[PDB]
């Protein structure tokens, strides 16, 4: 039940420009230093 | 007893007829398409 309501809640959702703002902070500087972690594990190529 | 039930529920506090569940696998969207497929109904009413 907890699926299908989410599925419904997510079907007709239309985006604000509060829940944007708040989704950009999130992923723009509260997730920072993890996103530094990630982007540097790319780029660490490795040969044998 | 649940008839009384739903009409309480729908008198105390308005509820869309679309937000209802009636179970996990039920779609509001294909429901009401098909529905409306299989008994056609007149437009001017709904729109005049």
């Known amino acids: 039940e907890v699926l299908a309501a989410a599925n419904s809640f997510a079907e007709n959702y239309s985006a604000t420009s509060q829940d944007m703002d708040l989704f950009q902070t999130l992923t723009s500087c509260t997730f920072s230093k993890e996103y530094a972690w990630k982007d540097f594990l790319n780029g660490i190529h490795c040969d044998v | ?48």
Do not use: W
């Open chain 2, 1 to 48: 007893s649940l008839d009384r039930e739903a009409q309480n529920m729908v008198v105390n506090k308005g509820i869309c007829p679309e937000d209802v569940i009636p179970d996990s696998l039920f779609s509001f969207r294909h429901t009401m398409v098909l529905l409306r497929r299989l008994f056609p109904q007149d437009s001017i009413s709904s729109f005049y």
